[PDB]
Amino acid sequence: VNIEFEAYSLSDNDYDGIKKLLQQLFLKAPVNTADVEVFGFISLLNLTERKGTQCVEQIQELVLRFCEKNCEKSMVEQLDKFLNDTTKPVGLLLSERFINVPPQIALPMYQQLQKELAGAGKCYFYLLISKTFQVTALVSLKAGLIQSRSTLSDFQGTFMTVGIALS
Amino acid sequence: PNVLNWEQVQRLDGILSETIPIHGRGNFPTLELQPSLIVKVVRRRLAEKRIGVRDVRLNGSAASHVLHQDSGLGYKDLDLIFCADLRGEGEFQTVKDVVLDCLLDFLPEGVNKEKITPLTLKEAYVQKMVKVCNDSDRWSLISLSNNSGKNVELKFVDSLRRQFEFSVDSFQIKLDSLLLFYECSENPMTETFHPTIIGESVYGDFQEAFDHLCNKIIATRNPEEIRGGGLLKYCNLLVRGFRPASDEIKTLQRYMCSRFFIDFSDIGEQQRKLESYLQNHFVGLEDRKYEYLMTLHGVVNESTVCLMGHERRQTLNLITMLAIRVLAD
Protein backbone atom coordinates (compact mmCIF):
# COMPACT_ATOMS: atom_id res chain seq x y z
CA VAL A 1 0.00 0.00 0.00
CA ASN A 2 1.42 3.34 -1.16
CA ILE A 3 -0.13 6.81 -1.40
CA GLU A 4 2.03 9.83 -2.28
CA PHE A 5 0.92 13.40 -3.03
CA GLU A 6 2.98 16.48 -3.89
CA ALA A 7 1.77 19.97 -4.78
CA TYR A 8 4.02 22.85 -5.86
CA SER A 9 1.12 25.17 -6.76
CA LEU A 10 0.27 26.69 -3.38
CA SER A 11 -0.10 30.41 -2.82
CA ASP A 12 1.87 32.26 -0.15
CA ASN A 13 -1.19 32.54 2.10
CA ASP A 14 -2.28 28.96 1.37
CA TYR A 15 1.05 27.94 2.91
CA ASP A 16 0.68 30.60 5.60
CA GLY A 17 -2.80 29.35 6.50
CA ILE A 18 -1.75 25.71 6.71
CA LYS A 19 1.20 26.69 8.93
CA LYS A 20 -1.30 28.20 11.37
CA LEU A 21 -3.35 25.00 11.10
CA LEU A 22 -0.32 22.89 12.02
CA GLN A 23 0.70 25.26 14.81
CA GLN A 24 -2.55 24.88 16.76
CA LEU A 25 -2.00 21.13 16.47
CA PHE A 26 1.39 21.63 18.12
CA LEU A 27 -0.06 23.74 20.92
CA LYS A 28 -2.84 21.24 21.66
CA ALA A 29 -0.43 18.36 22.32
CA PRO A 30 2.07 17.77 25.16
CA VAL A 31 5.49 19.35 24.53
CA ASN A 32 8.61 17.30 25.25
CA THR A 33 11.97 18.55 26.54
CA ALA A 34 14.94 16.28 27.27
CA ASP A 35 17.06 29.07 4.18
CA VAL A 36 14.16 26.59 4.30
CA GLU A 37 11.01 26.16 6.40
CA VAL A 38 9.42 22.77 7.14
CA PHE A 39 6.30 22.10 9.22
CA GLY A 40 4.08 19.05 9.59
CA PHE A 41 4.01 15.69 11.32
CA ILE A 42 4.95 12.03 10.88
CA SER A 43 2.40 9.61 12.34
CA LEU A 44 3.17 5.90 12.69
CA LEU A 45 0.29 3.57 11.89
CA ASN A 46 -0.53 -0.14 12.13
CA LEU A 47 -2.51 -1.43 9.15
CA THR A 48 -3.83 -4.59 10.84
CA GLU A 49 -5.98 -2.44 13.16
CA ARG A 50 -9.40 -0.94 12.47
CA LYS A 51 -8.02 2.49 13.41
CA GLY A 52 -5.12 2.02 11.00
CA THR A 53 -7.33 1.25 8.01
CA GLN A 54 -10.09 3.68 9.01
CA CYS A 55 -7.46 6.43 8.82
CA VAL A 56 -6.38 5.29 5.35
CA GLU A 57 -9.95 5.58 4.06
CA GLN A 58 -9.96 9.24 5.09
CA ILE A 59 -6.39 9.87 3.92
CA GLN A 60 -7.11 8.22 0.57
CA GLU A 61 -10.33 10.21 0.29
CA LEU A 62 -8.63 13.53 1.06
CA VAL A 63 -6.02 12.88 -1.63
CA LEU A 64 -8.77 12.01 -4.11
CA ARG A 65 -10.53 15.29 -3.30
CA PHE A 66 -7.22 17.15 -3.67
CA CYS A 67 -7.00 15.69 -7.19
CA GLU A 68 -9.96 17.77 -8.32
CA LYS A 69 -9.58 20.56 -10.86
CA ASN A 70 -10.24 23.91 -9.17
CA CYS A 71 -9.32 22.45 -5.77
CA GLU A 72 -6.63 24.80 -4.50
CA LYS A 73 -8.10 27.50 -2.29
CA SER A 74 -10.15 24.73 -0.65
CA MET A 75 -6.89 23.12 0.54
CA VAL A 76 -6.80 25.27 3.66
CA GLU A 77 -10.45 24.54 4.49
CA GLN A 78 -10.29 20.83 3.61
CA LEU A 79 -7.25 20.44 5.85
CA ASP A 80 -9.11 22.24 8.65
CA LYS A 81 -11.60 19.38 8.77
CA PHE A 82 -9.05 16.63 8.00
CA LEU A 83 -6.76 17.09 10.99
CA ASN A 84 -9.03 18.93 13.46
CA ASP A 85 -12.19 16.77 13.20
CA THR A 86 -11.93 14.50 16.24
CA THR A 87 -15.18 12.87 15.02
CA LYS A 88 -13.01 11.34 12.27
CA PRO A 89 -10.07 8.91 12.33
CA VAL A 90 -7.27 11.30 11.32
CA GLY A 91 -8.53 14.21 13.40
CA LEU A 92 -8.89 11.83 16.35
CA LEU A 93 -5.48 10.20 15.85
CA LEU A 94 -3.80 13.62 16.01
CA SER A 95 -5.51 14.55 19.29
CA GLU A 96 -4.19 11.40 21.01
CA ARG A 97 -0.47 10.69 21.59
CA PHE A 98 0.65 13.71 19.55
CA ILE A 99 4.14 14.68 20.75
CA ASN A 100 6.30 17.75 20.02
CA VAL A 101 10.01 17.06 19.59
CA PRO A 102 12.75 19.74 19.52
CA PRO A 103 14.40 20.50 16.15
CA GLN A 104 17.49 18.41 17.00
CA ILE A 105 15.11 15.42 16.95
CA ALA A 106 12.94 16.53 14.03
CA LEU A 107 15.69 17.15 11.45
CA PRO A 108 16.91 13.50 11.43
CA MET A 109 13.32 12.32 10.99
CA TYR A 110 12.62 14.74 8.14
CA GLN A 111 15.86 13.83 6.39
CA GLN A 112 15.24 10.08 6.53
CA LEU A 113 11.68 10.49 5.26
CA GLN A 114 13.12 12.60 2.44
CA LYS A 115 15.46 9.71 1.67
CA GLU A 116 12.85 6.95 1.96
CA LEU A 117 10.48 8.91 -0.29
CA ALA A 118 13.00 9.44 -3.11
CA GLY A 119 14.19 5.88 -3.89
CA ALA A 120 11.98 3.02 -5.06
CA GLY A 121 7.69 -2.72 7.18
CA LYS A 122 6.29 0.33 8.97
CA CYS A 123 3.33 2.34 7.66
CA TYR A 124 4.04 6.05 8.13
CA PHE A 125 1.58 8.91 7.57
CA TYR A 126 3.11 12.30 6.83
CA LEU A 127 1.91 15.80 5.95
CA LEU A 128 4.66 18.31 5.25
CA ILE A 129 4.54 21.89 4.01
CA SER A 130 7.80 23.61 3.12
CA LYS A 131 8.98 27.07 2.02
CA THR A 132 12.23 28.20 0.38
CA PHE A 133 13.12 31.90 0.58
CA GLN A 134 12.72 37.63 2.55
CA VAL A 135 11.10 36.46 -0.71
CA THR A 136 9.44 33.11 -1.43
CA ALA A 137 11.07 30.95 -4.08
CA LEU A 138 8.92 27.83 -3.74
CA VAL A 139 6.12 26.47 -1.54
CA SER A 140 5.45 22.73 -1.38
CA LEU A 141 2.83 20.55 0.31
CA LYS A 142 3.82 16.88 0.48
CA ALA A 143 1.60 14.32 2.18
CA GLY A 144 1.50 10.57 1.81
CA LEU A 145 1.35 7.03 3.15
CA ILE A 146 4.48 4.86 2.93
CA GLN A 147 5.88 1.55 4.21
CA SER A 148 9.60 1.79 4.85
CA ARG A 149 12.49 1.65 7.33
CA SER A 150 12.66 3.01 10.88
CA THR A 151 12.41 6.81 11.00
CA LEU A 152 11.47 6.84 14.70
CA SER A 153 14.60 5.51 16.50
CA ASP A 154 12.41 3.16 18.61
CA PHE A 155 11.32 6.37 20.38
CA GLN A 156 7.89 6.53 18.72
CA GLY A 157 4.96 4.16 19.23
CA THR A 158 2.15 2.96 17.03
CA PHE A 159 -0.47 5.69 16.55
CA MET A 160 2.08 8.02 18.14
CA THR A 161 2.45 11.21 16.10
CA VAL A 162 5.63 13.31 15.95
CA GLY A 163 5.58 17.03 15.18
CA ILE A 164 7.95 18.70 12.72
CA ALA A 165 8.87 22.38 13.03
CA LEU A 166 12.09 23.44 11.29
CA SER A 167 13.32 27.03 10.98
CA PRO B 1 -20.76 2.80 -34.90
CA ASN B 2 -17.98 4.20 -32.72
CA VAL B 3 -16.00 5.80 -35.56
CA LEU B 4 -15.71 9.57 -35.40
CA ASN B 5 -16.73 11.46 -38.52
CA TRP B 6 -14.72 14.07 -40.40
CA GLU B 7 -16.06 16.81 -38.11
CA GLN B 8 -15.35 14.94 -34.87
CA VAL B 9 -11.92 13.87 -36.14
CA GLN B 10 -11.08 17.44 -37.17
CA ARG B 11 -11.91 18.62 -33.64
CA LEU B 12 -9.67 15.91 -32.16
CA ASP B 13 -6.73 16.66 -34.44
CA GLY B 14 -7.01 20.34 -33.58
CA ILE B 15 -6.69 20.03 -29.82
CA LEU B 16 -3.92 17.40 -30.02
CA SER B 17 -1.90 19.57 -32.42
CA GLU B 18 -2.38 22.74 -30.38
CA THR B 19 0.81 24.13 -28.90
CA ILE B 20 0.21 24.56 -25.17
CA PRO B 21 2.41 26.89 -23.06
CA ILE B 22 3.83 25.09 -20.01
CA HIS B 23 5.18 27.80 -17.74
CA GLY B 24 8.08 27.33 -15.35
CA ARG B 25 8.95 28.85 -11.99
CA GLY B 26 11.91 31.15 -11.45
CA ASN B 27 14.85 31.03 -13.86
CA PHE B 28 13.25 28.61 -16.31
CA PRO B 29 11.89 29.13 -19.83
CA THR B 30 8.30 28.55 -20.80
CA LEU B 31 7.71 25.15 -22.37
CA GLU B 32 5.78 24.93 -25.65
CA LEU B 33 4.29 21.45 -25.93
CA GLN B 34 2.21 19.76 -28.60
CA PRO B 35 0.01 17.11 -26.91
CA SER B 36 0.69 14.67 -29.77
CA LEU B 37 4.43 15.08 -29.16
CA ILE B 38 4.04 14.31 -25.46
CA VAL B 39 2.22 11.08 -26.31
CA LYS B 40 4.91 10.04 -28.81
CA VAL B 41 8.07 10.84 -26.85
CA VAL B 42 6.73 9.51 -23.54
CA ARG B 43 5.59 6.26 -25.15
CA ARG B 44 8.90 5.83 -27.02
CA ARG B 45 11.09 6.67 -24.02
CA LEU B 46 8.95 4.42 -21.81
CA ALA B 47 9.42 1.63 -24.36
CA GLU B 48 13.18 2.16 -24.31
CA LYS B 49 13.00 1.33 -20.58
CA ARG B 50 11.13 -1.93 -21.34
CA ILE B 51 7.95 -0.48 -19.80
CA GLY B 52 4.88 -1.44 -21.80
CA VAL B 53 1.88 0.79 -22.54
CA ARG B 54 -1.41 -0.67 -23.74
CA ASP B 55 -2.85 2.49 -25.29
CA VAL B 56 -3.18 6.24 -24.87
CA ARG B 57 -6.57 7.92 -24.67
CA LEU B 58 -8.24 11.36 -24.20
CA ASN B 59 -10.63 11.90 -21.25
CA GLY B 60 -13.48 14.08 -19.93
CA SER B 61 -14.26 17.49 -21.42
CA ALA B 62 -11.94 17.27 -24.41
CA ALA B 63 -13.54 13.95 -25.38
CA SER B 64 -17.02 15.33 -24.85
CA HIS B 65 -15.91 18.34 -26.90
CA VAL B 66 -14.79 16.38 -29.96
CA LEU B 67 -18.02 14.36 -30.00
CA HIS B 68 -20.20 17.46 -29.59
CA GLN B 69 -19.07 21.09 -29.57
CA ASP B 70 -22.53 22.37 -28.61
CA SER B 71 -22.69 20.41 -25.33
CA GLY B 72 -21.16 23.42 -23.58
CA LEU B 73 -19.13 21.38 -21.09
CA GLY B 74 -16.21 23.01 -22.93
CA TYR B 75 -12.65 22.08 -23.82
CA LYS B 76 -10.75 23.66 -20.93
CA ASP B 77 -8.25 20.99 -19.83
CA LEU B 78 -6.39 18.29 -21.72
CA ASP B 79 -6.26 14.92 -19.91
CA LEU B 80 -4.07 12.15 -21.35
CA ILE B 81 -4.47 8.64 -19.93
CA PHE B 82 -1.61 6.21 -20.50
CA CYS B 83 -3.03 2.74 -19.89
CA ALA B 84 -0.10 0.59 -18.73
CA ASP B 85 0.02 -2.51 -16.57
CA LEU B 86 2.76 -1.14 -14.30
CA ARG B 87 3.03 -4.26 -12.18
CA GLY B 88 6.32 -4.35 -10.29
CA GLU B 89 9.95 -3.26 -10.03
CA GLY B 90 9.10 0.29 -8.97
CA GLU B 91 7.89 0.94 -12.52
CA PHE B 92 5.81 3.80 -11.12
CA GLN B 93 9.09 5.56 -10.33
CA THR B 94 10.71 5.02 -13.74
CA VAL B 95 7.52 6.50 -15.19
CA LYS B 96 8.10 9.52 -12.97
CA ASP B 97 11.70 9.55 -14.20
CA VAL B 98 10.87 9.19 -17.91
CA VAL B 99 8.34 12.04 -17.87
CA LEU B 100 10.92 14.30 -16.23
CA ASP B 101 13.56 13.40 -18.81
CA CYS B 102 11.03 14.18 -21.53
CA LEU B 103 10.49 17.61 -19.99
CA LEU B 104 14.25 18.10 -20.33
CA ASP B 105 14.24 17.51 -24.10
CA PHE B 106 11.29 19.85 -24.71
CA LEU B 107 13.28 22.77 -23.30
CA PRO B 108 14.11 25.63 -25.69
CA GLU B 109 17.59 25.69 -27.16
CA GLY B 110 20.06 27.75 -25.16
CA VAL B 111 19.70 26.12 -21.72
CA ASN B 112 22.79 24.68 -20.02
CA LYS B 113 21.12 21.32 -19.50
CA GLU B 114 23.98 20.22 -17.23
CA LYS B 115 22.74 22.24 -14.24
CA ILE B 116 19.18 20.92 -14.63
CA THR B 117 18.47 18.01 -12.30
CA PRO B 118 15.23 16.01 -12.45
CA LEU B 119 14.32 17.57 -9.11
CA THR B 120 14.86 21.08 -10.46
CA LEU B 121 12.62 20.21 -13.42
CA LYS B 122 10.01 18.95 -10.95
CA GLU B 123 10.10 22.14 -8.88
CA ALA B 124 10.13 24.23 -12.08
CA TYR B 125 7.23 22.90 -14.17
CA VAL B 126 5.24 20.36 -12.14
CA GLN B 127 2.01 21.51 -10.49
CA LYS B 128 0.76 18.25 -8.95
CA MET B 129 2.06 14.71 -8.52
CA VAL B 130 -0.15 11.91 -7.22
CA LYS B 131 0.50 8.17 -6.87
CA VAL B 132 -2.03 5.70 -5.48
CA CYS B 133 -1.45 1.97 -4.86
CA ASN B 134 -4.28 1.02 -2.52
CA ASP B 135 -6.46 -2.10 -2.94
CA SER B 136 -7.82 -2.46 -6.49
CA ASP B 137 -6.42 0.94 -7.56
CA ARG B 138 -3.01 1.38 -9.18
CA TRP B 139 -2.43 4.73 -10.87
CA SER B 140 -0.15 7.76 -11.10
CA LEU B 141 -0.46 11.39 -12.15
CA ILE B 142 1.77 14.26 -13.27
CA SER B 143 -0.06 17.57 -13.72
CA LEU B 144 1.88 20.03 -15.87
CA SER B 145 1.18 23.69 -15.19
CA ASN B 146 0.11 26.60 -17.39
CA ASN B 147 -0.24 30.19 -16.16
CA SER B 148 -3.14 30.81 -18.56
CA GLY B 149 -5.45 28.29 -16.85
CA LYS B 150 -5.14 25.25 -19.13
CA ASN B 151 -4.14 22.05 -17.33
CA VAL B 152 -2.18 19.31 -19.12
CA GLU B 153 -2.59 16.26 -16.87
CA LEU B 154 -0.63 13.08 -17.63
CA LYS B 155 -2.31 10.06 -16.03
CA PHE B 156 -0.72 6.60 -15.85
CA VAL B 157 -3.42 4.08 -14.93
CA ASP B 158 -3.01 0.37 -14.27
CA SER B 159 -6.40 -0.06 -12.57
CA LEU B 160 -9.01 2.46 -11.40
CA ARG B 161 -12.35 1.59 -9.77
CA ARG B 162 -14.60 4.43 -10.97
CA GLN B 163 -13.58 6.08 -14.25
CA PHE B 164 -16.55 8.42 -14.72
CA GLU B 165 -19.21 10.53 -13.01
CA PHE B 166 -22.15 11.13 -15.40
CA SER B 167 -22.77 9.89 -18.93
CA VAL B 168 -21.41 13.03 -20.61
CA ASP B 169 -17.93 12.81 -19.05
CA SER B 170 -17.58 9.07 -19.69
CA PHE B 171 -16.15 9.16 -23.22
CA GLN B 172 -12.55 8.08 -23.81
CA ILE B 173 -11.07 8.37 -27.29
CA LYS B 174 -8.11 6.24 -28.35
CA LEU B 175 -5.27 8.15 -30.00
CA ASP B 176 -3.09 5.43 -31.57
CA SER B 177 -4.85 5.74 -34.94
CA LEU B 178 -4.18 9.48 -34.99
CA LEU B 179 -0.50 9.22 -34.09
CA LEU B 180 0.17 6.49 -36.65
CA PHE B 181 -1.45 8.73 -39.28
CA TYR B 182 1.09 11.52 -38.73
CA GLU B 183 4.06 9.17 -39.20
CA CYS B 184 2.77 7.35 -42.28
CA SER B 185 1.76 10.23 -44.56
CA GLU B 186 3.30 13.54 -45.42
CA ASN B 187 -0.10 14.48 -46.86
CA PRO B 188 -2.44 16.50 -44.60
CA MET B 189 -5.84 15.43 -43.33
CA THR B 190 -8.82 15.76 -45.69
CA GLU B 191 -12.51 14.84 -45.69
CA THR B 192 -11.53 11.61 -47.48
CA PHE B 193 -8.01 11.10 -46.04
CA HIS B 194 -8.47 11.07 -42.27
CA PRO B 195 -7.79 8.31 -39.72
CA THR B 196 -10.33 5.87 -38.32
CA ILE B 197 -10.76 6.76 -34.64
CA ILE B 198 -12.93 4.85 -32.16
CA GLY B 199 -14.76 6.42 -29.25
CA GLU B 200 -15.48 4.43 -26.11
CA SER B 201 -17.40 4.99 -22.88
CA VAL B 202 -16.47 3.76 -19.40
CA TYR B 203 -20.23 3.80 -18.69
CA GLY B 204 -22.05 1.19 -20.82
CA ASP B 205 -22.54 1.61 -24.55
CA PHE B 206 -20.95 4.41 -26.55
CA GLN B 207 -24.19 4.83 -28.49
CA GLU B 208 -26.22 5.28 -25.30
CA ALA B 209 -23.76 7.82 -23.91
CA PHE B 210 -23.45 9.67 -27.24
CA ASP B 211 -27.21 10.19 -27.49
CA HIS B 212 -27.22 11.60 -23.95
CA LEU B 213 -24.43 14.05 -24.81
CA CYS B 214 -26.29 15.10 -27.95
CA ASN B 215 -29.79 15.49 -26.48
CA LYS B 216 -28.36 17.06 -23.30
CA ILE B 217 -29.47 14.26 -20.96
CA ILE B 218 -28.22 13.76 -17.40
CA ALA B 219 -27.76 10.01 -16.82
CA THR B 220 -25.50 7.92 -14.61
CA ARG B 221 -24.95 4.44 -13.22
CA ASN B 222 -23.31 3.00 -10.09
CA PRO B 223 -24.33 5.89 -7.80
CA GLU B 224 -22.63 4.17 -4.85
CA GLU B 225 -19.57 6.30 -5.69
CA ILE B 226 -21.63 9.48 -5.14
CA ARG B 227 -20.33 12.37 -3.04
CA GLY B 228 -21.41 15.72 -1.67
CA GLY B 229 -20.15 17.19 -4.92
CA GLY B 230 -22.43 14.72 -6.69
CA LEU B 231 -25.36 17.00 -5.90
CA LEU B 232 -23.33 20.02 -7.00
CA LYS B 233 -22.13 18.28 -10.17
CA TYR B 234 -25.74 17.33 -10.90
CA CYS B 235 -26.82 20.98 -10.82
CA ASN B 236 -23.86 22.16 -12.91
CA LEU B 237 -25.19 20.14 -15.83
CA LEU B 238 -28.79 21.09 -15.11
CA VAL B 239 -28.13 24.84 -15.28
CA ARG B 240 -26.00 24.51 -18.44
CA GLY B 241 -29.19 23.30 -20.15
CA PHE B 242 -29.01 19.58 -19.40
CA ARG B 243 -32.13 17.68 -18.36
CA PRO B 244 -32.78 14.34 -16.64
CA ALA B 245 -34.32 11.51 -18.62
CA SER B 246 -37.14 10.64 -16.15
CA ASP B 247 -36.01 7.22 -14.97
CA GLU B 248 -36.00 6.72 -11.17
CA ILE B 249 -34.03 9.75 -9.98
CA LYS B 250 -36.10 9.09 -6.87
CA THR B 251 -33.43 7.53 -4.66
CA LEU B 252 -30.65 9.32 -6.55
CA GLN B 253 -31.85 12.91 -6.11
CA ARG B 254 -32.36 12.05 -2.44
CA TYR B 255 -28.95 10.38 -2.09
CA MET B 256 -27.04 13.40 -3.41
CA CYS B 257 -28.96 15.51 -0.90
CA SER B 258 -28.48 12.84 1.76
CA ARG B 259 -24.77 12.49 0.99
CA PHE B 260 -24.24 16.27 0.81
CA PHE B 261 -25.77 16.78 4.27
CA ILE B 262 -23.60 14.00 5.73
CA ASP B 263 -20.43 15.33 4.08
CA PHE B 264 -21.30 18.91 5.18
CA SER B 265 -23.19 18.81 8.47
CA ASP B 266 -22.24 22.28 9.76
CA ILE B 267 -23.90 25.46 8.55
CA GLY B 268 -20.45 27.02 8.24
CA GLU B 269 -19.20 23.99 6.30
CA GLN B 270 -22.07 24.23 3.81
CA GLN B 271 -21.66 27.97 3.31
CA ARG B 272 -17.95 27.54 2.57
CA LYS B 273 -18.39 24.69 0.08
CA LEU B 274 -21.15 26.66 -1.65
CA GLU B 275 -19.28 29.99 -1.72
CA SER B 276 -16.18 28.17 -2.98
CA TYR B 277 -18.14 26.32 -5.66
CA LEU B 278 -19.64 29.56 -6.96
CA GLN B 279 -16.38 31.43 -7.50
CA ASN B 280 -14.34 28.40 -8.62
CA HIS B 281 -16.87 27.64 -11.39
CA PHE B 282 -18.62 30.95 -12.26
CA VAL B 283 -16.05 33.72 -11.80
CA GLY B 284 -17.44 37.01 -13.09
CA LEU B 285 -20.56 35.10 -14.15
CA GLU B 286 -23.01 36.59 -11.66
CA ASP B 287 -25.99 35.77 -13.89
CA ARG B 288 -24.95 32.10 -13.89
CA LYS B 289 -24.11 32.32 -10.18
CA TYR B 290 -27.67 33.41 -9.47
CA GLU B 291 -29.29 30.90 -11.82
CA TYR B 292 -27.14 28.17 -10.26
CA LEU B 293 -28.25 28.81 -6.68
CA MET B 294 -31.83 28.92 -7.98
CA THR B 295 -31.51 25.53 -9.66
CA LEU B 296 -29.68 24.13 -6.61
CA HIS B 297 -32.42 25.64 -4.44
CA GLY B 298 -35.28 23.96 -6.28
CA VAL B 299 -33.48 20.62 -6.52
CA VAL B 300 -32.81 20.45 -2.77
CA ASN B 301 -36.35 21.57 -1.95
CA GLU B 302 -38.31 19.21 -4.22
CA SER B 303 -35.96 16.21 -4.01
CA THR B 304 -35.26 16.20 -0.26
CA VAL B 305 -38.59 14.79 0.94
CA CYS B 306 -36.74 14.21 4.21
CA LEU B 307 -39.09 14.82 7.14
CA MET B 308 -36.31 16.39 9.22
CA GLY B 309 -35.79 20.13 8.78
CA HIS B 310 -32.59 20.63 10.78
CA GLU B 311 -30.67 19.90 7.58
CA ARG B 312 -33.38 21.01 5.14
CA ARG B 313 -34.39 24.40 6.57
CA GLN B 314 -30.86 25.59 7.37
CA THR B 315 -29.53 24.36 4.02
CA LEU B 316 -32.47 25.92 2.19
CA ASN B 317 -31.75 29.25 3.93
CA LEU B 318 -28.06 29.32 2.99
CA ILE B 319 -29.15 29.07 -0.64
CA THR B 320 -31.72 31.85 -0.21
CA MET B 321 -29.25 34.21 1.47
CA LEU B 322 -26.48 33.68 -1.09
CA ALA B 323 -28.96 34.05 -3.95
CA ILE B 324 -29.88 37.47 -2.54
CA ARG B 325 -26.33 38.56 -1.69
CA VAL B 326 -25.37 37.63 -5.26
CA LEU B 327 -28.44 39.39 -6.67
CA ALA B 328 -28.09 42.59 -4.60
CA ASP B 329 -24.45 43.08 -5.75
Numbering used by the authors:
A (entry chain B): 57 to 90, 121 to 206, 214 to 226, 289 to 322
B (entry chain A): 63 to 391
Quote the passages of the study that discuss this structure, keeping the authors' original sentences.
Here, we report that the nuclear protein BCCIPα, but not the alternatively spliced isoform BCCIPβ, binds FAM46 and inhibits their PAP activity. Unexpectedly, our structures of the FAM46A/BCCIPα and FAM46C/BCCIPα complexes show that, despite sharing most of the sequence and differing only at the C-terminal portion, BCCIPα adopts a unique structure completely different from BCCIPβ. A helix-loop-helix segment in BCCIPα inserts into the active site cleft of FAM46, thereby inhibiting the PAP activity.
The FAM46A/BCCIPα-ΔL complex yielded better crystals. The following description of the FAM46A/BCCIPα structure will refer to this higher-resolution structure. BCCIPα forms a large binding interface with the active site cleft of FAM46A, burying ~2600-Å2 solvent-accessible area. The strand at the outer edge of the active site cleft of FAM46A (residues 189 to 196) packs against strand β1 in BCCIPα in an antiparallel fashion, integrating the β sheets in the two proteins into one extended β sheet. However, CPB1 of Plk4 leaves the active site in FAM46C unoccupied, and its binding does not affect the PAP activity of FAM46 (5). In contrast, as shown in Fig. 3A, helices B and C and the loop between them at the bottom of the β sheet in BCCIPα are wedged into the active site cleft in FAM46A. Lys155 at the tip of the loop between helices B and C in BCCIPα sticks deep into the active site and makes a direct interaction with the catalytic residues Asp141 and Glu215. To accommodate BCCIPα, the C-terminal lobe of FAM46 rotates away substantially from the N-terminal lobe and creates a larger opening, as shown by a comparison of the complex structure with FAM46C in the apo-state. Most of the residues in FAM46A involved in the binding interface are conserved in other FAM46 family members, which underlies the interaction of BCCIPα with all the FAM46 proteins.
